[PDB]
């Protein structure tokens, strides 16, 4: 049973909708644009989105592909999932647009000090779903308060500036590992207790200076990992600084957030803590739960490697709106 649809026009397109959503009002830009709605069958408010030139080039099919693909695994509390996709199309001679269908979402969290209490749910909220994200073999890569939306009682939901990126996310460095996500945790948990911007680098080099002022040059186990005879002479090539008392740059902190946070940044990704771990840290034993942390479904991200032809990924692409199960 296909439903009915309507068609409207929004921010200058043509949308065809099945009628259970209900008057949606743009939320906004230059990607796939946004539409809030009212869901009938749920109750619920939801974000409603159009992908713009889903199939228009090969990048542009396989975009949208990883799109769906990505969603489509997600089931967890902590992080975003589909609650619907759909298409107009009833062959896929006809296809063409496609449509996702996710929570409407109240506050990201962008914004004062909060009490060492919510940092601590909050925090732990976001590991939760790194737990999640990380055991199916997934790097989040761009975590920061904007991707992650929380609602009215406070539960909170990672959603897909160089401030919160590891440094070795930025610096290009292949001994990178899933721990940048915990970097960039790091970074805003930090942003919670103070109130204030850890890094705040006004430029790419600036960022890396802060960096190092706080955690030091990097030690000797760290050199002995560097491969380019120039990187390794221009790293010591830096004002040779050492590390500082995280107790003394997060005064009045809880010394088990402070802890921590001196497990989440560190320069070398080999010696910082696991999501998995830090759920474990004292820091947390008022929310930590080990049989309400679930780990993920393995992900077969195979397709990444792959060079294909448009109707191929937007074959593919059908056949995943097809079989869509509703949660």
Same mark, same amino acid.
């Given at each position: 049973?296909?439903?009915?649809?309507?068609?409207?026009?929004? #921010?200058?397109?043509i949308?065809?909708?099945?009628?259970?959503?209900?008057? +949606?009002?743009?939320?906004?830009?230059?990607?796939?644009?946004?539409? %809030? %709605?009212?869901?009938?069958?749920?109750?619920?408010?939801?974000?409603?989105?159009?992908?713009?030139?889903?199939?228009q080039?090969?990048?542009?099919?396989?975009?949208?592909?990883?799109?769906?693909?990505?969603?489509?695994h997600?089931?967890?509390?902590?992080?975003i999932?589909?609650?619907?996709?759909?298409?107009?199309?009833?062959?896929?001679?006809?296809? #063409?647009?496609?449509?996702?269908?996710?929570?409407?979402?109240?506050?990201?969290?962008?914004?004062?000090?909060?009490?060492?209490?919510?940092?601590?749910?909050?925090?732990?909220?976001?590991?939760?779903?790194?737990? =999640?994200?990380?055991?199916?073999?997934? *790097?989040?890569r761009?975590?920061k308060?904007?991707?992650?939306?929380?609602?009215?009682?406070?539960?909170?939901?990672?959603?897909?500036?160089?401030?919160?990126?590891?440094?070795? *996310?930025?610096?290009?460095?292949?001994?990178?590992?899933?721990?940048?996500? *915990?970097?960039?945790?790091?970074?805003?948990?930090?942003?919670?207790?103070?109130?204030?911007?850890?890094?705040?680098?006004?430029?790419?080099?600036?960022?890396?200076?802060?960096?190092?002022?706080?955690?030091?040059?990097?030690?000797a186990?760290?050199?002995?990992?560097?491969?380019?005879?120039?990187?390794?002479?221009?790293?010591?090539?830096?004002?040779?600084?050492?590390?500082? #008392?995280?107790?003394?740059?997060?005064?009045?902190?809880?010394?088990?957030?402070?802890?921590? +946070?001196?497990?989440?940044?560190?320069?070398?990704?080999?010696?910082?803590?696991?999501? %998995?771990? %830090?759920?474990?840290?004292? =820091?947390?034993?008022? =929310?930590?739960?080990?049989?309400?942390?679930?780990?993920?479904?393995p992900?077969?991200?195979?397709?990444?490697?792959?060079?294909?032809?448009?109707?191929?990924?937007?074959?593919?692409?059908?056949?995943?709106? *097809?079989?869509?199960?509703?949660?």
């Open positions: 049973e296909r439903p009915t649809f309507y068609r409207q026009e929004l #921010n200058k397109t949308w065809e909708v099945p009628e259970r959503y209900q008057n +949606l009002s743009p939320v906004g830009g230059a990607y796939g644009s946004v539409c %809030a %709605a009212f869901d009938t069958k749920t109750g619920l408010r939801v974000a409603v989105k159009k992908l713009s030139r889903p199939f080039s090969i990048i542009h099919a396989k975009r949208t592909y990883r799109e769906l693909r990505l969603l489509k997600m089931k967890h509390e902590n992080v999932g589909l609650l619907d996709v759909f298409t107009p199309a009833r062959s896929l001679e006809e296809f #063409n647009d496609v449509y996702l269908v996710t929570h409407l979402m109240g506050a990201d969290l962008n914004n004062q000090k909060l009490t060492d209490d919510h940092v601590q749910f909050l925090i732990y909220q976001i590991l939760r779903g790194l737990k =999640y994200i990380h055991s199916a073999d997934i *790097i989040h761009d975590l308060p904007s991707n992650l939306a929380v609602n009215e009682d406070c539960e909170l939901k990672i959603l897909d500036t160089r401030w919160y990126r590891a440094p070795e *996310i930025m610096l290009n460095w292949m001994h990178y590992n899933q721990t940048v996500d *915990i970097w960039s945790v790091g970074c805003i948990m930090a942003e919670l207790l103070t109130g204030r911007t850890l890094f705040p680098g006004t430029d790419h080099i600036d960022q890396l200076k802060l960096i190092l002022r706080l955690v030091g040059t990097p030690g186990e760290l050199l002995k990992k560097i491969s380019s005879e120039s990187a390794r002479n221009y790293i010591q090539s830096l004002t040779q600084m050492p590390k500082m #008392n995280f107790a003394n740059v997060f005064i009045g902190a809880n010394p088990l957030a402070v802890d921590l +946070l001196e497990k989440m940044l560190v320069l070398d990704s080999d010696k910082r803590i696991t999501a %998995a771990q %830090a759920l474990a840290h004292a =820091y947390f034993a008022q =929310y930590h739960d080990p049989d309400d942390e679930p780990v993920a479904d992900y077969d991200q195979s397709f990444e490697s792959r060079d294909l032809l448009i109707d191929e990924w937007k074959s593919l692409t059908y056949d995943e709106v *097809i079989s869509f199960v509703p949660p």
